[PDB]
Swiss-Prot record, chain A:
Gene name for this UniProt entry: DAP2
Transmembrane segments: 1-15
Annotated compartments: Vacuole membrane
Similarity remark: Belongs to the peptidase S9B family.
Name of this chain's protein: Dipeptidyl aminopeptidase B
UniProtKB/Swiss-Prot annotation, chain B:
Binding of GTP, residues: 103-110, 185-189, 245-248
Lineage: Archaea, Thermoproteota, Thermoprotei, Sulfolobales, Sulfolobaceae
Gene Ontology, cellular component aspect: signal recognition particle
Main localisation: cytoplasm
Protein name: Signal recognition particle 54 kDa protein
Entry text on domains: Composed of three domains: the N-terminal N domain, which is responsible for interactions with the ribosome, the central G domain, which binds GTP, and the C-terminal M domain, which binds the RNA and the signal sequence of the RNC.
Native species: Saccharolobus solfataricus (strain ATCC 35092 / DSM 1617 / JCM 11322 / P2) (Sulfolobus solfataricus)
Quaternary structure (record): Part of the signal recognition particle protein translocation system, which is composed of SRP and FtsY. Archaeal SRP consists of a 7S RNA molecule of 300 nucleotides and two protein subunits: SRP54 and SRP19.
Family: Belongs to the GTP-binding SRP family. SRP54 subfamily.
Catalysed transformations (reactions): GTP + H2O = GDP + phosphate + H(+)
EC id: 3.6.5.4
Amino acid sequence: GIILVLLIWGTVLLLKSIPH
Amino acid sequence: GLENIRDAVRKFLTGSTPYEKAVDEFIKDLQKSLISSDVNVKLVFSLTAKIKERLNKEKPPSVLERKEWFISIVYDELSKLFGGDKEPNVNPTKLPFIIMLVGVQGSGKTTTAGKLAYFYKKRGYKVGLVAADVYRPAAYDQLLQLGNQIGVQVYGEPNNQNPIEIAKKGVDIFVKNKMDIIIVDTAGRHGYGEETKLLEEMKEMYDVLKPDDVILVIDASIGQKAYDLASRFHQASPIGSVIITKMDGTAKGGGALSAVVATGATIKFIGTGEKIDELETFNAKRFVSRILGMGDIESILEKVKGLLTLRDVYAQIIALRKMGPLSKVLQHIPGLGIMLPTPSEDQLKIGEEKIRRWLAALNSMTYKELENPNIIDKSRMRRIAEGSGLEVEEVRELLEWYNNMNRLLKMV
């Protein structure tokens, strides 16, 4: 349960590759 | 009679009293309403039975208050009773599709045939009414009357005293305009004291004409009684459906639906008036809802519904984008909330029409290519990219993430 609170969690750290 | 239910629900759903001391008043009132609706009694206690069994073993899901989860069972159950699946396929299969109407006298066998053939005309088919209504000449008059009032041809030659001939003659002719649907209103004899008369006249027509569908009309006034003729009907023609009329001029409706279902017949429509538009497709579930709770059951619907790596990836991420507007979400997480002006940050995230391109690429992928992606190449990567709307860059990032997690969990 905590497994996803990490995986689904640490995603936004580099949500930088996105367009503009 | 049966309509008094939503209230019994609007009460049970307003924190009236203690949980268990409330469950019962409902069961009291449900049974009262059902029985008061002419549903068979052995069925009612039966139902409440399978309802107390579930309140027992079945364990309440998150975001499900002791009581709401409760109704979820009621609805489900009242639902099995009146239906048990999704709306039948009132949609024809092969063309032309042929339909026979075996209505017992007084059953609106005829008004329905009109009401029904309008149903289909109005929905875009080329309907054709065959007046094999032999046992009634007045049916002839009244028939072609409403017939012309709706732009539908109606074959028929009065006093032929032999409908099976009228049928083959009339149906084989309605293959001329290449009519799409053909409604054969077969004569219904034996007034109310039917016995097994019409069933014989029926197995006949079926053998001779051999049509695509057979529908026995029932007056919704017959209460649970409808169980006998219906049962003999299903027996005779296991490939047919019932239509229950005059639903609105009785308080014993439920008895007929529940009843007709009891046997195993299917209810494709339900009459609700004298008018021509008074006939609608029978949606078992929507009916249970329409009666239990307007949309109250609706909220209960949202909640329960939405609720080695790339696999969990989708299932997982999927349930997250779904979410749902409520504060019970943190009820799952061992943390007590503090302020609410904060989640407006969530409504804003959903602001951008497109929330995540990840579920987009994950969809643009084969259900195997979602398993072992280290087989993904640059050609496969621009394929999955262009297919999703993303760029080879938004996708490379994606792929690298699956593995970094592949490696991370290895590191634990």
